[PDB]
């Protein structure tokens, strides 16, 4: 009762853009519309820690050239702490893009002794493992897609397969390492389908020779770094001499969107993989907001005064308390695992907010009318592939 | 649910086992009463006794 | 080939001891291609200010390895966290002289780390060994909601899986709880009497006080505790004759410093004997990638097998922890700890000192009190 009244019966989160407002508003609306995420009738509020000073929100947009960033991160940290204390933000949202900005944000979080969650498109090598800093890799390692490819061979024991890399610079190291982790897997002869050939006849002859060599060694193939048009050309070349499934079983080792997975040019029985949802920035923002709100609500269910009211009552005073409120929020975030729209967001190592995106695996099979279509053979998530049918 | 009078042949056997082995007891009947059987589970493979 | 030795230790006395040990090791080193340099850095009274000073001093000197010391706080994962963080991504191994904690052993956080002290949870396995001899067919496990506690519970369960024991029941205590007697309601539920638990002194004080409330302080119950609760705020509520724990060289910082100096002296000569010797990077901003000598350097360092230092028996392995550790057990009577047991890690050497079971019971009873009525 008293704690909610003091905090306004709401959970405040600060958002700082190092280098988006509509996405934040959408995330806040989605968090509010998800009733029961935060108990005790607590709603999610977002406070922007822009570089501007104190003032009411004006309904007048003016575009002006911002001054260069200050060389002293201490002033930025103090301003961020003061804004968070004014808005009572238990957790901080950041969008770091450079090493210096990330260091400044981490310094601000450490001074405020509160967790700061920053979404980074590229998962840079992180030295500091401070719980006051948490990072969400928007673009996770592509090896997960590689983990999908071998997953196909796990469905029906396709331990023998050929490799077709339509890209000379394609990185098939992760999939090769995953396959070599199991002694049962038997990768076939390496087929490099290069596009440098200048004539149709020479490319057709090379593809026919590769298919002839692969057929008598392995019963299936996996294609990585091949486009939809390249896949269609390869399928046409295979069908020119009659090389087709199920004697030549096709599988796609690359992620291909369902929209771009056109039924035309795809021989029946071919296996394809794609993303369950287009991972836009809004989905990641909503998932991060949901995870932070769940962490705050869980910490409030046992320590509402600690979770809601931040520990830093002054920007220039670093409280030497036994248990800081921001420390509690950081622990809750490090223990927070949620299932957002873009996939599963899990906190590993108390610092990495990894978003394992759900994927769909389909097989080239006829639709109810008989025309070819992409029927999802299953959904793959967390390394587990469950067949829909 | 009400306290009930229970007695029986096997109740006499129970009294004997009480007398020899020195343990008290509190008895109650069963929920659905079908001597127990091996029954397939609602949402798993088979492992359920009723 | 100047090899600098940078370290962080509390107070100037520890820095002086480290410098003296470095000088003695240089005097005791027959290698003519090694130059001994020691840099002393004090603890910065700020987590924010510690990282910048640490990067500006130790990294720029191109020193070899980082030695940890006892944190200024009585128990906090703050002092060695910045050291394992800033230098962790630079492929620089670090040795924790006062690292008796198992938190930094997940191999995903602070991977480049060697534990110079046994983990507290490791002695939990000794409890199984402690239970191996003195009967104790079944016991009840109690663990706080702690990552170290969870790991210890998992390790003890794995050990029990060898002897095929269900450990009766395991209660998951909640850290920071003010009402723990309710969780101990099931304490009288089972028929056993052997209670295996150990936690923070602040956490253990309330439980130790509340045990007498549930009449658990009476004789016929068995409580086994760790050294974390051996002394501290809980010492007021500790039961008499309670079997606690203690560890050899528990406060001998000089012994650990000497052992680490000897180990580093051996490791430097071991490393400076083959090609591909990646010299330490210079500067904290210029270095944007790890050194070439990474896992091979760690493997080469993990080869010292001798009796060096006051501690001796340097057998670091697994995640970076030594082997054949010595544990001590002091009998509690009249609010005083009287040593009654010593273990070398293979067999515990008992003593003729009186071992009273809880409630001051000289006799040792069994952990199965048969029920007087059934359902």
From Swiss-Prot, chain A:
Glycosylation sites: 41, 160, 171, 181, 192, 322, 335
Subcellular location: Cell membrane; Postsynaptic cell membrane; Postsynaptic density
Modifications the protein undergoes after translation, according to the UniProt entry: N-glycosylated.
Primary role: Component of a non-conventional N-methyl-D-aspartate (NMDA) receptors (NMDARs) that function as heterotetrameric, ligand-gated cation channels with low calcium permeability and low voltage-dependent block by Mg(2+). During the development of neural circuits, participates in the synaptic refinement period, restricting spine maturation and growth. Forms glutamatergic receptor complexes with GluN1 and GluN2 subunits which are activated by glycine binding to the GluN1 and GluN3 subunits and L-glutamate binding to GluN2 subunits.
Family named by the database record: Belongs to the glutamate-gated ion channel (TC 1.A.10.1) family. NR3A/GRIN3A subfamily.
Subunit record text: Heterotetramer. Forms heterotetrameric channels composed of two GluN1/zeta subunits (GRIN1), and two identical GluN3 subunits (GRIN3A or GRIN3B) (in vitro). Can also form heterotetrameric channels that contain at least two GluN1 subunits and at least a combination of one GluN2 and one GluN3 subunits (in vitro). Does not form functional homomeric channels. Found in a complex with GRIN1, GRIN2A or GRIN2B and PPP2CB. Probably interacts with PPP2CB. No complex with PPP2CB is detected when NMDARs are stimulated by NMDA.
UniProt protein name: Glutamate receptor ionotropic, NMDA 3A
Organism: Homo sapiens (Human)
Stretch of the intact protein here: 38 to 493 of 1115
UniProtKB/Swiss-Prot annotation, chain B:
Post-translational modification: NMDA is probably regulated by C-terminal phosphorylation of an isoform of NR1 by PKC. Its phosphorylated state is influenced by the formation of the NMDAR-PPP2CB complex and the NMDAR channel activity.
Annotated tissue distribution: Detected throughout the brain, in brain cortex, cerebellum, thalamus and olfactory bulb.
Domain of life: Eukaryota
Glycosylation sites recorded in the entry for this protein: 22, 42
Localization, UniProt: Cell membrane; Postsynaptic cell membrane; Synaptic cell membrane; Postsynaptic density membrane
Task of the protein: Component of N-methyl-D-aspartate (NMDA) receptors (NMDARs) that function as heterotetrameric, ligand-gated cation channels with high calcium permeability and voltage-dependent block by Mg(2+). NMDARs participate in synaptic plasticity for learning and memory formation by contributing to the long-term potentiation (LTP). Channel activation requires binding of the neurotransmitter L-glutamate to the GluN2 subunit, glycine or D-serine binding to the GluN1 subunit, plus membrane depolarization to eliminate channel inhibition by Mg(2+).
Free-text domain note: A hydrophobic region that gives rise to the prediction of a transmembrane span does not cross the membrane, but is part of a discontinuously helical region that dips into the membrane and is probably part of the pore and of the selectivity filter.
Family label: Belongs to the glutamate-gated ion channel (TC 1.A.10.1) family. NR1/GRIN1 subfamily.
Subunit structure: Heterotetramer; the NMDAR subunits are modular and harbor tiered domains that function in concert to regulate opening and closing of the cation-selective ion channel pore. Forms heterotetrameric channels composed of two GluN1/zeta subunits (GRIN1), and two identical GluN2/epsilon subunits (GRIN2A, GRIN2B, GRIN2C or GRIN2D) or GluN3 subunits (GRIN3A or GRIN3B) (in vitro). Can also form heterotetrameric channels that contain at least two GluN1 subunits and at least two different GluN2 subunits (or a combination of one GluN2 and one GluN3 subunits) (in vitro).
The protein's name in its UniProt record: Glutamate receptor ionotropic, NMDA 1
GN (gene name): Grin1
């Amino acid at each position: 009762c008293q704690i909610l009244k003091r905090i306004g019966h709401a959970v405040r989160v600060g958002a700082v853009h190092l280098q988006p407002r509509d996405a934040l508003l959408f995330a806040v609306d989605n968090l509010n519309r998800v009733e029961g995420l935060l108990p005790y009738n607590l709603s999610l509020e977002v406070v922007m820690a822009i570089e501007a000073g104190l003032g009411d929100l004006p309904l007048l947009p003016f575009s002006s050239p911002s001054s260069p960033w200050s060389s002293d991160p201490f002033s930025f940290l103090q301003s961020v702490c003061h804004t968070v204390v004014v808005q009572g933000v238990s957790a901080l949202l950041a969008f770091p893009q450079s090493q210096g900005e990330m260091m400044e944000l981490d310094l601000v979080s450490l001074v405020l002794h509160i967790p700061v969650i920053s979404i980074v498109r590229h998962e840079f090598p992180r030295e500091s493992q401070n719980p006051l800093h948490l990072q969400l890799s928007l673009e996770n390692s592509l090896s997960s897609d590689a983990d999908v490819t071998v997953s196909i061979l796990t469905m029906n024991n396709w331990y023998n397969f050929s490799l077709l890399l339509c890209q000379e610079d394609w990185n098939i190291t992760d999939f090769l390492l995953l396959t070599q982790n199991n002694s049962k897997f038997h990768l076939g002869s390496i087929i490099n389908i290069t596009a440098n050939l200048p004539s149709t006849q020479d490319l057709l002859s090379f593809l026919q020779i590769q298919l002839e060599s692969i057929k008598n060694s392995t019963p299936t193939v996996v294609m990585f770094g091949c486009d939809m048009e390249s896949i269609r050309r390869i399928f046409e070349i295979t069908t020119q001499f009659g090389v087709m499934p199920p004697e030549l079983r096709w599988v796609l080792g690359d992620s291909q969107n369902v929209e771009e997975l056109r039924t035309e040019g795809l021989p029946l029985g071919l296996i394809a993989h794609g993303k369950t949802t287009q991972s836009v920035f809004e989905h990641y923002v909503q998932d991060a907001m949901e995870l932070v709100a769940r962490a705050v609500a869980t910490a409030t269910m046992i320590q509402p005064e600690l979770a809601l009211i931040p520990s830093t009552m002054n920007c220039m005073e670093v409280e030497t308390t036994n248990l800081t409120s921001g420390q509690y929020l950081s622990r809750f975030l490090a223990n927070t695992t949620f299932r957002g729209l873009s996939g599963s967001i899990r906190v590993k190592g108390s610092t990495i907010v990894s978003s394992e995106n759900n994927f769909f695996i389909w097989n080239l099979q006829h639709d109810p009318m008989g025309k070819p279509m992409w029927t999802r053979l299953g959904s793959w998530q967390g390394g587990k592939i469950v067949m829909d049918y | 649910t009400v306290p009930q009078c229970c007695y029986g042949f096997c109740i006499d056997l129970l009294i004997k086992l009480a007398r020899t082995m020195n343990f008290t007891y509190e008895v109650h009947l069963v929920a659905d009463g079908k001597f127990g059987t091996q029954e397939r589970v609602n949402n798993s493979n088979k492992k359920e006794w009723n | 080939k100047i090899v600098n030795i940078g370290a962080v230790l509390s107070t100037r006395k520890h820095e002086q001891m480290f410098r003296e040990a470095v000088n003695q090791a240089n005097k005791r080193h027959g290698s003519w291609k090694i130059q001994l340099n020691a840099t002393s850095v004090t603890h910065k009274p700020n987590a924010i200010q510690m990282a910048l000073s640490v990067c500006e001093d130790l990294i720029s000197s191109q020193v070899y390895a980082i030695l940890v010391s006892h944190p200024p706080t009585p128990n906090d994962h703050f002092t060695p966290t910045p050291v394992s963080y800033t230098a962790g991504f630079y492929r620089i191994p670090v040795l924790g002289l006062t690292t008796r904690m198992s938190i930094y052993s997940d191999k995903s956080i602070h991977l480049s780390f060697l534990r110079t002290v046994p983990p507290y949870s490791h002695q939990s396995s000794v409890w199984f060994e402690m239970m191996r001899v003195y009967s104790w067919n079944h016991i009840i496990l109690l663990v706080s909601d702690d990552h170290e506690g969870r790991a210890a519970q998992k390790r003890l369960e794995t050990l029990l899986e060898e002897r095929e024991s269900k450990a009766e029941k395991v209660l998951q205590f909640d850290p920071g709880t003010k009402n723990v007697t309710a969780l101990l309601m099931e304490a009288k539920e089972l028929e056993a009497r052997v209670i295996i638990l150990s936690a923070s002194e602040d956490d253990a004080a309330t439980v130790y006080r509340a045990a007498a409330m549930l009449n658990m302080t009476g004789s016929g119950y068995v409580w086994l505790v760790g050294e974390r609760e051996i002394s501290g705020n809980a010492l007021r509520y500790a039961p008499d004759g309670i079997l606690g724990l203690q560890l050899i060289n528990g406060k001998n910082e000089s012994a650990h410093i000497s052992d680490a100096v000897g180990v580093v002296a051996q490791a430097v000569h071991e490393l400076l004997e083959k090609e591909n010797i990646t010299d330490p990077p210079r500067g904290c901003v210029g270095n944007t990638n790890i050194w070439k000598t990474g896992p091979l350097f760690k493997r080469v360092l993990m080869s010292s097998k001798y009796a060096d230092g006051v501690t001796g028996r340097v057998e670091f392995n697994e995640d970076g922890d030594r082997k054949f550790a010595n544990y001590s057990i002091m009998n509690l009577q009249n609010r005083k700890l009287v040593q009654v047991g010593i273990y070398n890690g293979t067999h515990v050497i008992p003593n003729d000192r009186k071992i009273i079971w809880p409630g001051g019971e000289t006799e040792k009873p069994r952990g199965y009190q048969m029920s007087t009525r059934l359902k």
